[model samples]
Target: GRLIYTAGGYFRQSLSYLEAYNPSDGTWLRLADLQVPRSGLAGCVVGGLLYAVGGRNNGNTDSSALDCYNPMTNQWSPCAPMSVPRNRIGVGVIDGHIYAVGGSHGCIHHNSVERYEPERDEWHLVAPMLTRRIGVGVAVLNRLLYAVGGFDGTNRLNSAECYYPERNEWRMITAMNTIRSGAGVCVLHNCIYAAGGYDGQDQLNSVERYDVETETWTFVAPMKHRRSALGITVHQGRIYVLGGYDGHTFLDSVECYDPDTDTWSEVTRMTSGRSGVGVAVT
Candidate 1:
């Protein structure tokens, strides 16, 4: 059966906790702690191994270290680090390589992007984005990598862009309806959905979808909670939004959206609250 794995995140502060949720049973299995505890990390599974990318560690220090977890061994091992340290980075896997998008290092936000070659255990710079961003939401649609709304240091953003790996270039795309930093993004049903995030003035519960064929965005059903820094993923045809901050409090609650019904339903909660959590499916 497929499972959703959630990695390090912030509650009171960055945590090293790791766990796997069995959707089939709505139960969780606590796994090994990360080698270096972190928050705002990005996670993805490739070639049967789980990778935890750049994030901030204790003392709010940025980390460039890349860690890989092998379930067969139930342990984590360090891999090649990124050229620049990052926290709140957006990550996606394409053609067996991992692309790490913009985030921030301390006070400075970034537009820089890098790609990691697993076989070589190396990272190299890629074309930078037109605008700098932190807490960006990234997803892949029709083989193109999309970077959604995020903070550019000055203010929150509603802007978006996509990359063409074949050409090693990026182009601006239709922006979202609302400014969002830390939004949960995922690909489903041939469209990309960007869910709840901080909109500068407040945390948001609003949701929207981008249609690649039409090159447009349309509002979708809102979630029950206004959340930011949430972890989201698609599984068994539904989108699962995990722990996050709801403006006033860190959240442990979970929600699932069924596109066919255009509705969100509450799911099993996590064992503890987490914001800036990293989520991936296997």
Candidate 2:
């Protein structure tokens, strides 16, 4: 019923938009290429606006460039820059404001979170995360911003926490049963779904869920292929998994999860294999 987008994979990478389902009578159309192609950036959708923030160029995996789009016109434009250049940051929209959580600024991790006010075309500094985490999955749900598992420069983590927008602060929430990083996360039916990720030593195919109502984490169905730095988003009731690398070749594969059935199924192949790609949905 809507158009979802994928950030193209890094080998000669670009970006692409995908139709939710075959319309039988219709097909997908390409829009435009990024002025510069990069990967490992974080992406989020607010209202009808899609934004891709901080990605690395061929030089590095961490980048600070910010880009915005209008699906109606299929056009893109520059947005205000971040306080620090950070790739692998988690981005989301809450209370009409855009929040980009922690990321790496090349050598060190960023504990600070930045807020963008589109109406004013400006940014403001905010409180930092308790721990400087990068490559975590961030989601705005039940009026709270959750920062999930990620790397701390020293090791991977299974711990997750939530940020209370009203208080302009964060607090430890539930923890994932598995310790991993570079995973994909999205919320559906008030429950948060954590998917494909990697521990420092191995790639992950395990999947799990955090029940907001029960305040607990439980195991769920696993994905067929192990992937990390994958892109995830929820459309209607389904969770979509996009391209990511297996620490080998980057992936062009795409898949979806049906919450109603507690199962996953394959979908169309991506235009290209992507590692550290960003995704936006409207």
Candidate 3:
């Protein structure tokens, strides 16, 4: 009964399309479109509702608008906007609250972070990250929100950090093995894995896993295809990475990693190529 949902993204242009992937049967079902077409947005599920956060809209305008999707009704409704418009943002949920991390507005990169309280229908600015980042990858492990590699204004970053909500602070962590932007990040088996991304020059196939206890990052099995701006999520004990951009073209291929085997295998392809897509699981 579980599903992996992928929302608005760039095919050739910003799209409002939404689709759900069924892991059991390897099938995809088209869902209602987002009210506003966007790309480079971030999505997370809070209290069983899917929230699509900031991104650039069809008009190429950076947006601060937030929209919530109710699966029961198959519709999306607008929610309170974030104070700063952003695109290529990263999002993670902790204790029922969604945290929107570093992204960019036009040419400006942001280090700011915001937390949304669904019940209040509001967003409150929290501690900013140590470095300005756009296209950052965020994931939660042991209740801590990890913001991984992304592009800064001048260069792609290898730096990483984590946010401790209790202390309202961000502490710098070990940098990644490679500088990356638009990497796919997720937590599995108490460890955080960052997958393929653009390393300034080219799309990458390499992956790295961070061990919290050891405070170290080590290389893991590489993916089959070079990808950036990919959609990633953990489903049924496997990490699935969906549509993304290769150096030459947009990709529709899907690949999944099994930690037990330390290998990646091809999965069913998406209906169309999607880069800068937002992915969530329910």
Candidate 4:
């Protein structure tokens, strides 16, 4: 399997970079650069290809661009752009199609949603989210896309919502127990887990998980330290949180969450600290 890390910088400006983290060997390898440099973009793996969606260009501008990375050839190619540009978005896949959820337009939070089809290399309009959000946590559970806590451009939010593609609508779901923005969300064994993020006044070490059947969030073990804009992935039934920011310091710490035991334990650290990194498992 592969965990891919791409476009993410301290802010909206930095060199475009790509790297691959191999879980098997516990190593990080530099890959190819993106078509252009970007940060706060939503990215995921689909059909063995890396698809990076809308992100901030430079300054306060938002981008509608989409780029696809083919690992076999180690090259990137442009794909169709979204109707609306955004950053701090969430990307999810279901039945082979990609969904880009609520993010920011650099002015206000966006409630719009877009869908992309690989077969046609095109994007289509979909149901907008119930809340305008940026820095939201999103994951697929039983094929439904769940958008979790994020900043509404005003306050850090704990509210959560779910989108059903076939119904083409969004329905309000149970809010998280704690308010968090830029948290890492991942699904393991059918449960949604949300880890460290900023909570308006300070960075957080708290973590929570959602029970789909109960439609509720349960607070689990907290992280060793506070973090925001970190990367996450699930492997061997454990949740791994990568490099991120902790308000005062950028972090290179790696931690793992064990669902069965409801605990967290520190793992191998990265060579350098990083934040807003996009993580994927293959």
Q: Which stretches of candidate 2 lie over 4 Å from their true place?
A: 12-27, 59-61
User: Which ten contiguous residues of candidate 1 have the minimum total lDDT?
Assistant: 51-60
lDDT of 1 by residue, 1-282 (tens): 878999999877789998999889888999999977899988898998989998898656998889998887999999999999989999988988999999989898989999999999999999999889899999988789999999999989999999999998999999899999999998999999999999998999999999998999999999998899999999999999998988788989899999999999988999998888788988
lDDT (10s digit) by residue, model 2, range 130-176: 87888888877988988898888887888888888779888988788
- Cα deviation in Å at residue 190, candidate 2? 0.3
Record all residue pairs in model 1 with backbone atoms less than 3 Å apart, i.e. clashing.
Answer: none
Q: How far is each candidate from the true structure, as Cα RMSD in Å?
A: 0.8, 2.3, 0.8, 1.8
Residue-by-residue lDDT tens digits, candidate 4, 129-228: 8788899888998879999989888889999898987898999998888898999998988889899888898889998888888988888899997899
TM-scores across all candidates? 0.98, 0.93, 0.98, 0.94
Evaluated at residue 78, the lDDT of candidate 1 is 95
Clashing pairs in 2: 9-274, 40-276
- For candidate 4, report its TM-score: 0.94
**CA shift at 25, candidate 3, in angstroms?**
0.7
Candidate 3 residue lDDT tens string, 55-159: 898557988989999888999999999989989999999999989898988898999999999999999999999999999999998889999999989989989
lDDT of 3: 0.92
Query: Residue 22's C-alpha lDDT in candidate 1?
Result: 89
